[PDB]
Symmetry: C2
Subunit: 218 residues, 2 copies
């Protein structure tokens, strides 16, 4: 029923990270309605396959290769949803479950067509941005500006330097997303803007602020 | 790569029968680029599953259930091709290979949408009628009129009775499709017309002729 089990585990990791939930084996098990033991065995095989690493505190860390694939699966999934909703007219309650199968069989060529054919490929019908469209191709720690890449990762805030800021509007944004020193947050450059996420709340940083906030790896 | 192997074997049986080729294990092996031994093992499992029977002369006979599924797979396959060609604009050289994956994951609901959304669902872009649209839901031997059903089957012509016919135009049609007594031909009611096929040449019978031609089971 899962069609491509490996790809489903990756897509589920992806969407847990999007939501700011720590990707743990029991959350994957719950989301895919699979047994914990079955998940643990499939996770072991994904490790052998180069797709994931189980960190010492048991969270799943997608390898850059795993992440690239997960991003591809998500992109296909969201473009299929837009197709099914925008063009096919499939009833909305069935769209995600259809795209959940289609995502494992859509080629890159179909996607490049969809990008031309659809009105807007900013987001799925369910509110989330479509990732990967670029790859389809149509002083403790480190300053956020230097540490962020085009692939998101979870890091820890070790300093904010509010004393050096002129752009003072984002202070409250950070506070309302409860981002403080010691918060573990996702970072990405996407761009020319860095974004911090905490608990699925996004803060798009101005560059003065991205120069000032310093992070450490988890 | 086959996505649903069982469904691929059925779709390949279907298309061999369409072409008037006897569905034999070596022709399936050849078409799917699978080993003979692998085909024979998968065929054994399909038998255990109720989908096919290997007749005493080694041809594959789809069970009515196998045939119903094969017809469903074909319908999904052809509607996907029309979608990919008519709406998506996928380059024609890639359409069949894409639909070859999509056919195993399209629900009935998507198909019912496609039937409304597409211009014409008479045929795939590759010239063959789309079957199953009805089930989607939007004196030796026996006279052809009595023996034919909505599901095609291979039978043997045992009598033609040309002496009793007034409609004399179809005689040559039969002759050019080399349908003579002793010819093994496919029959279907589809309708209100019976069709005889021999070697992938179709003859649509007038009812006077369908009353006259008598057939036996193989
Ligand atoms: Ni979805
Ligand atoms: Ni899926
Ligand atoms: Ni085809
Ligand atoms: Ni296929």
């Amino acid at each position: 029923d899962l069609v491509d089990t490996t790809a489903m585990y990756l897509r589920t990791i992806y969407e847990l990270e999007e939501e700011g939930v720590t990707p743990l084996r029991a959350r994957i098990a719950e989301r895919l309605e699979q047994s914990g033991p079955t998940v643990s065995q499939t996770v072991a095989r994904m490790e052998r396959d180069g797709l994931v690493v189980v960190a010492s505190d048991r969270s799943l860390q997608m390898t850059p290769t795993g992440r690239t694939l997960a991003t591809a699966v998500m992109r296909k999934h969201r473009l299929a949803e837009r197709l099914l909703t925008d063009i096919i007219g499939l009833d909305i309650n069935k769209v995600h479950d259809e795209a959940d199968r289609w995502e494992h069989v859509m080629s890159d060529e179909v996607e490049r067509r969809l990008v031309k054919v659809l009105k807007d490929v900013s987001r799925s019908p369910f509110g989330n941005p479509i990732p990967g469209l670029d790859e389809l191709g149509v002083a403790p720690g480190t300053r956020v500006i230097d540490a962020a890449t085009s692939m998101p990762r979870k890091v820890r805030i070790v300093q904010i330097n509010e004393i050096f800021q002129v752009e003072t509007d984002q202070f409250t944004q950070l506070l309302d997303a409860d981002i403080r020193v010691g918060s573990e947050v996702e970072i990405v450059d996407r761009d020319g803007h860095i974004t911090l996420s905490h608990n699925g709340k996004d803060v798009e940083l101005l560059d003065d602020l991205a120069h000032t906030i310093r992070i450490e790896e988890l």
